[model samples]
Target: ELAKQELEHMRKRLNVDMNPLYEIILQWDYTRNSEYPDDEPIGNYSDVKDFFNSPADYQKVMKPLLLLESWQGLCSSRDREDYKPFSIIVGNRTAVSDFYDVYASVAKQVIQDCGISESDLIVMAYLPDFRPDKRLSSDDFKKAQHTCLAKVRTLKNTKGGNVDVTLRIHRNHSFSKFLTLRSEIYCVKVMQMTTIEREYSTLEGLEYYDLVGQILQAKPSPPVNVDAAEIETVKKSYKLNTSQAEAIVNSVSKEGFSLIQGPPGTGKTKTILGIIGYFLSTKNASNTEQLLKKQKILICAPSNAAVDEICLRLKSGVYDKQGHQFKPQLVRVGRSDVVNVAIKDLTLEELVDKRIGERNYNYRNRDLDRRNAQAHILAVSDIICSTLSGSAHDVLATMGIKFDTVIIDEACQCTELSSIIPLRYGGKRCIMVGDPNQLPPTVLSGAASNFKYNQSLFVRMEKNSSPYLLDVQYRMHPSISKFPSSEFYQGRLKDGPGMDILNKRPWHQLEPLAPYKFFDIISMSYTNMEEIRVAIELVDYLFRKFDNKIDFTGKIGIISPYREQMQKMRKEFARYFGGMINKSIDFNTIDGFQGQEKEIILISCVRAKSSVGFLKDFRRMNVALTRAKTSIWVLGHQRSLAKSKLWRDLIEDAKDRSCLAYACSGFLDPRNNRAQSILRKF
Candidate 1:
């Protein structure tokens, strides 16, 4: 009842009255109790009376019981160093799919996997019918628990309802000799894993099952197409380049969902801001009062970094045709610690009552009152920025708050089900921005992967509404950007004005001969320490010269495909440069470096000796290539890298550009004999 009360409070705060995740589409008959559980039973409740004492304890456990590992752990014993292992049969139907026969089959499978004699196997069934006392007294039933009367058919688990569950766990010893008695053990790690998997699975599984099925089967409803002149109107209205203007115009409509595909180095954040600007702008323009009172727009991303960037851009305010400034009343909903510090002042709580400043300076309000008041203010803000998961906060749900339009950036990195959590709250339109050709969502199990767990809703929308690709890039030199543009983008990427600045080196005499270079080193190791060492060695060498001469004017970033290589290079940088390796330099894996760029990037291709392990993801390679604004230094063995098509193409393109030709003459390459010898291998 307390939980129910809290949920109700949250709903009101979010500005809604009923459940947002699910609604009552169908009602089930819950008239009587069944003595014998059916294969396909009508919706019913079960009281797990044995393990739990109060309804509080039942509530605490039932939510976690729905997780996959929780069911997996129930069959196994603890503490055999890895040897005393037991596999779970996931029909953990204690709450939902309460089939007794199904439970019996799982028990049998556990016994078989445990690889023990039937006599040694101590079966602990916690169902209402199969009590320990009843089984202990009945001889036939006791033996039946041993094996094979597992008269089980298919079990159904996925039904939505409230269930009161209680269970005391029991595990036998992993060693055969220690199986005689009840020396108890608790599985804390298993319990924690189960809770996370259960929470993520149950909410997503039940909420978006129908939506996911529909999307997977066919294309979603077609987007309301925009005319060329309307796109041009937005383009000229905002002084946007052709591509940026078109993307915004196609997406600004209140019809169905729209998509914008942003490649690496492309102004995704700028494009997002442009779309927001166009959305808020009326035909007559300048309607701040109307927008603040009623209009609500949501800008979200799969990550805090992306969300923070979007919020910062929106808060910065853009100019109109005649230089009129427009800054909307925006609220960021996330932890201040994770959010970028510069924009923390604009967060929902901060803007609502100026609490962020006062809280730090010994303000006299209690935390609870301040939070409740902040929630009320957040419910009223015109724009809300948060992470995809963070957007589904209980406060928002409790408020029953809905947005007029939702703009989700980095949509490719989020799963379809998780994406629905935000899409559910959208009152009018959803605008998704990402490149499907880049990274997809990361998932664990192969079965889930096969079931398209990695496929995002943005990627799945390839058919209905063609994604408007942002063509002009502002982050990379034409030389550094060429290969990725050709390989991943089908050669349509345009150079922004920033390329002109990047092309003319500030310290032309000290700069490397070309903007792109592939330094080949053939030394062999699993992670290739030789390749790792030389990559940073080249950076150290450059900075040493720059310190004496030009003072190297821009930021430098080092990236690697492997975590091991990144750690090694990081250590070397600290050892070599000390305080000089300050905020201006960064060392990170390829995954961490996405949505970030540097003037000069040095990439350590960690794989060597005919094995391109993590380097096989051309997307990672593409990101590495595109991160550099002025120059790229790619260090690896040419012989090992030429095995992959993308790597070979990159090598070939660099050769034709003469980026490698000049690099081959430098000390890093040292010999035309080795360079020419490896180049011919491709």
Candidate 2:
């Protein structure tokens, strides 16, 4: 046909063998740059001479963009501190760079196996959080990162030559993901090589860079109505802290309901608002004159952004700042303020500019501002930051309300049916703030032994898992609780501890994604939200697999299940990843991305498939899988691959699923062909 196209282009360039596809399948983008700046041309401190002069200029400018790369799958490139100092390693197509010479003697034997040191950096990996093609499934992604809105904890991933990607964390905010639909790769293309920085993620970055603070807000200073014998001006308007009033005086001195678990700096809403203001003025003796004479002290949350954070922490009183007329809510009842519960058409100027403006509690005032209304209801105010409709069961059978004490903050989350509405609310005593190995409870009912609790508040919310396990943690840096409590807290904790290599991301030789791309998929009306359309297609395949490399800018969070399904999945994922509107992608919902973060994250569990099984309110799917440190792609519920029955009793075992010699996965098992033949000799 033209001399057979010049003898098939001169025998395809003299029999094209192109040296192992031009050095390893046309050598992918090994990322490295920074030469183009005359202003940068004389800086003497050349970061180890530009990290040893850009790996031969990134193998000669990414080898002509990898020979104009045709198309494939997981491309790679990152460095706003490659996994920080050592979360070991966490996917983006995993890369911890061959253990890097025994990551400082396996981080001092995982910090003496897990008791910890080296000025402890803390990291707690409970594993399994993102599913729907991010694989692993069941333990519903660490029971949705230990229920309520977050729990997991850890952060440190950094890499250059050695390891450092430490992580046992909960950080979120995603603006783009989905890496590859005809190569659109966005959220400003993986935030230009990991650039994130909302000061790390915010409520002062979760109480100082993810130590924790953002759990259903019921305080902008809610303590002032003094009466319990005026205990020093109500603990001086309690900003609380003493481990948040000792996690509320140890969950109202314990009884039938006490759970205040830990993880992110261990505050679980400052110890469940300091043990619900000490179970209404020290364990209910007419709760100090009925919480200062019926000003009210109740709290329940599951959403209206956790009932507008119980209508702004029961208005415990704060912004009178000095000289204005009418500003209410700041109740001042023996200083616990209002604790929680609200919505009776609040209006002393939108509840005093929502308790004096800028205390954003997750905001609401979108005009109905009745003080604000989205279908009214919200009334028995003194304290009611609520929405799991009175802990569930048709709004506690139409608000028959009941309870004397309850504290399920981060109580290892996703709750097996709102722990069956605690005797409808008369709950005689129940305390659960969380971290039971961080993340759980987004009930579609598949296991807590295939739970289905015909009621009794989902069989008294299962129990066990968190009988009271708050072993010291203030949020990562304390050598992250040894290899996730030694591989799922059983042997208690001994195996490979932590710090194995940070900012270089090696965490003792990390590996956990082989037949594991996590998936659940079954989101009913929002066009089958395959977890928000695979997080809008994995952020458009990773901005077309990282073209021009990466640079988007901060704040990208995206939680679902309300805010009208995150505005119907952020308007079809912003019409195919920021089509024309391009405001990056800060969408929110899981109570407005709680205390947010995001260099790239795309969460969408919208409570799997809402008949809302698996233990009812299921801790709002464990507060949207912890939140994110970077990497969470859940789309949950293909009945979580045949109704997840607690993903084969919490991440497989039955002799590792009929033992093919210790449960392997890909490359036909055998430890995935010996960890992929030791990744080509590492």
Candidate 3:
């Protein structure tokens, strides 16, 4: 009951009405005078008196009304500054003719006249608030109000003067309030509305109510002991650390909830793969059909990329004694367009296509054949992979396919409601793998966030039970990992064996350069040209110094906090190196580089003003600091960055290590002979 109430409260908070940015008063019929000569006065003035008579008059009048009402706010103030006045023709919809052709013509004219591209057009519905008792005047028409705003996904003009509009309404915004009057709906450009609707839908259709109860009650089932011989075999095969092995054994042995807290570069993916291997091994060892039925596992993540990565790793196949392979019959479930090309053949749709050859059949029979084939494949498959929402696809539920175990990777990146979607599939044992110290779920609604809607199930569940922490990290050099280990992980993270080899790079051996460095460039702007110049010069110098010794492809990553700065760096790199820009070096925002790593990372801090912007988000900073294995170089203004305690600590850390340097003209200008001497000194 408490879980139900909490879910209701969250739903209400998530569905709160958003204030409209701007309201447009659409005029259908008005005379053009000296005061407002810009009004085009939709439809001929002679047809105004025949409002209730001819269907042609109604068709002409309603055509423009429907067209204008469906106008989507694709062209925002960010795109252009010019103000364009448009017209609408409002009248009765009785016995109107087909208006698709008219809609097409007028839509084209509006686009051309307003100098807006066809791609910039969106559909909006405006609900007019008016009373028939009041005599309408030009002033009153201009002062007309809309009761509510709605965004339309698709608009179709059908025959018999009928219009089909798919309204994308949230739970809070109801259309029933305007049904009593002759109301029109208008659309506004709001990016966060889609996320809000997704959260509402997930909450409304929660499949596993008891799982939420478990979360609410903070009661997880006790762990059971597994065979010592089996644990050693799996541990040696996967070459996992003690914590990772324990996590895998505990996760597979338990029949309820489990959590694995994986800090940065701690091989979370490998540990998940080990757990999957154990489950598959159990099925391979069992001889009975009932045991096979209980071995079906569902793997899910918040992003498609993470799911694809798991699929790619699974393709290699795990091995057992006598070199026998326990390859999984894995099926990835998602949209064909977005699925990774390498794993496209493993998707349910592609598998179905291959199963049913190009034999001709009716459309209805063809769909049935495809469904049966898909069901058969899913029944025989050992594992299924998909995004959290993709797991809720109708085909999975209708086919009656359920998993005994569900593993959610990167669980902290999704909302609690999103995580519940996969658990609804009769999963008895659930294991969530993620780092709560990294980025949390992205929630756009301030009210929803205030209600703690952005907090993921992984973070929330941590309060109930301590997660199995992957205590050893293998990705970063000891020198590079020291600060983040101390700052973020409370110095509990230890460097794995053979990580010392990461510090043997030529750049690491260079004098005055450490595994991490902070170059203070005292400049300001979203696109800091000074920082860009220094970064480019540094990259050029590294390549020059190492020549062909370093395999630069995919080893170097350039990150910035702002898109504008990242784009500028890309353009500058293209202009400077020309063909060398295709070296496969990644250029992305800080958020984009999460869960990714490189041998060397160059970060361009774009904020150099009094306001630190999103620099205050320490999770983002932790991600930036942890992405590099060999070295990390940050370019920022010391004065601007020192405003925050986190940034101040980082700067101070760099200074203590003697790796902090100031941006100089000699270093930035390649034409200067002093540049060569300056570069040699570093």
Candidate 4:
């Protein structure tokens, strides 16, 4: 009764009269003396006996069980007579399919950990007997305590009660007694891998992963029996470079963040693509594939664009396609394009035709609808991507999703620690691909911090932190890539440096349309309020100075901080650039520009003042300063930039600032040229 009371108390805490998550939709009819179990006792006439007879009479009762694990530890009052793993096979259900998946997934994980076969366990499934629109009933249950379901043919005609929960769960079965004697001596262990993101709430095996991790850590063990070759097989099958996958999988028996760092241009993107592909394809114990073909990878990127590109690049040969949708007409479908439709609620066909309003960036929703576009994405696709915000939102949305491995791309620019919401998706394997130096979290700088919540699922399931750093830079030539790559991205050395495979083939062979310059860059001034006016005046000055004879039809981007300054500049500088340059500008209020770059770039950084935390450090400033292929210029208070040691280190050799490329305060920053002279105006 107390347990059930706790749930009612929590309900009031949420301020909702009733939460669907808390609603009990199905349960077997167990009668020690004709009674109900899935209920909320709420009447004054309810004694312990009365509550046991009717679960619905009280608003609260013996701890309201929410997860499957809770069922394992349940101490039934009848059990006081004689009890040890008594069978009360339940059918946890909801209108939501994910709830069903969670219920099944939890059972599967526990069974796997317990080292038990399907025949050894009993399952009570709730099969609604009524028509779709017909009212629900308590007799809708079909019991499956040992292997096959109970011998329930159909609903027996009775007094009209709009309920049908006819499933029976008793230890009096021949199958139950036979299995009990067969596995008496084995040490029982339960490993419950959960959605790090609070998914799988519908499952009875909630928070069991925490217990498993704790047990693994606290228990003294026989020297780990895992063979090196066997471990390698698991890692390779997952397409993870040995240690990267092992670090997460091996140490997962501990607590904390399972961090995976990959350097720039080392095929980190492709490697991750393959890794996720491997996990998704091979999660089932049955699948087998050549090392090259069988990896079940689940690639997750920080941006939808990157994920889209990755799916487009390797969908055909990446992994064995599973789920129903990808089997037919798949040769023509794009790899990562499943993201185009979010199946969180709509069926595959419905998703294709339905027009949803207030759609998410991924166009997914959390509802009880059977045709969940997002669920299909989670079930069928090998790779998924979205910004950290989107991943966070998805974490909040999904209550039952399980992934074997999760690999993150563009780790440098991400606020990974704060992005715990996404880490919730990866089940047993959680990997992060990032170079600390390249982008050590633009939001929080100075030191390395675990962004995942301390008591969150990741921490409980996490054990050891195996750090993998990709050192090499295959993005640029040795000269250009080495300096910028090494200074900002630390994982390069540890990752053995990534190779720019395209360089060997030559850029001339496969490249975009050959163009002189896609867009021109205009430097804007950032000294006080009015000096910026002089900078806007310089936009046309630079345009007239260049663009002498190149035809272009791209939008000119006017990026800056401080809307007041941008507004002032827009009003005054509108006519200065004439019709050639549109005064269209949106102030992002960001310290640096990481998104929406163009061939023609215009930058107005208001706070290039200090470099203590890398907020507006030389690396960030240079990232914005040099975003164009053909032309680039900067207009800022030279004093503020020069005042900082880090900024000074970035542009020491001012004479050739025209082509020094990516900005970085590499080891050689001290010897570099640090000043710019206005020989030509912009």
The deviation in Å at residue 516 for candidate 3 is 2.5
The deviation in Å at residue 109 for candidate 4 is 45
lDDT of each: 0.55, 0.34, 0.64, 0.35
Better of 3 and 4 by lDDT: 3
Q: What value does the lDDT take at residue 62 in candidate 3?
A: 28
The superposed Cα distance between candidate 1 and the true structure at residue 497, in angstroms, equals 1.7
Misplaced by over 4 Å in model 1 are: 1-214, 217-223, 283-293, 318-323, 339-342, 352-380, 426-428, 441-452, 463-465, 506-513, 521-525, 529-537, 549-554, 563-585, 606-616, 662-682
lDDT of 2 by residue, 151-247 (tens): 1112233343332322111122121122112221101011111001110111111211110111211111122232343333233445433434444
Supply the TM-score for candidate 4: 0.42
Q: Taking the candidates one at a time, how many backbone clashes does each contain?
A: 16, 180, 12, 91
The C-alpha TM-scores of every prediction are 0.63, 0.21, 0.66, 0.42
Clashes of 1: 16
Better candidate number, 2 or 3, judged by TM-score: 3
Residue-wise C-alpha lDDT for candidate 1, range 497-596, written one tens digit per residue = 7686756554334435347777766445436666656665667666665657555645788888788878887777788678777765788888888757
Error of 1 at 519 (Å): 2.7
